[PDB]
Structure 1
Amino acid sequence: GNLYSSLPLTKREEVEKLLNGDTWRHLAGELGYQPEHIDSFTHEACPVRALLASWGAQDSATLDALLAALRRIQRADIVESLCSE
Structure 2
Amino acid sequence: GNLYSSLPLTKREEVEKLLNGDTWRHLAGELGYQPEHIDSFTHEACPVRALLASWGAQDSATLDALLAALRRIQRADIVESLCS
Superposition TM-score, scaled by structure 2 size: 0.86
After superposing on structure 2, the runs of 4+ consecutive aligned residues of structure 1 that deviate more than 4 Å are none
Worse-superposed segment, 29-38 or 6-15: 6-15
CA distance in structure 2 between the partners assigned to 1:56 and 1:27 by the alignment: 13
Which structure 2 residue ranges, 5 or more long, are not aligned? none
Worse-superposed segment, 75-84 or 58-67: 75-84
CA distance in structure 2 between the partners assigned to 1:9 and 1:23 by the alignment: 20
Answer yes or no: is 1:18 the counterpart of 2:2. no
Tell me how large the CA RMSD over aligned residues is: 1.4
Whose helix fraction is larger, Structure 1's or Structure 2's?
A: 2
| Cα shift readout 1:9-67 (whole Å, capped 9, x = no counterpart) | 12211222111221110110110112122111122121121122111101301111111
Superposition TM-score, scaled by structure 1 size: 0.85
Q: Is the 8 A contact 1:15 1:48 kept in 2?
A: no
Which structure 1 residue ranges, 5 or more long, are not aligned? none
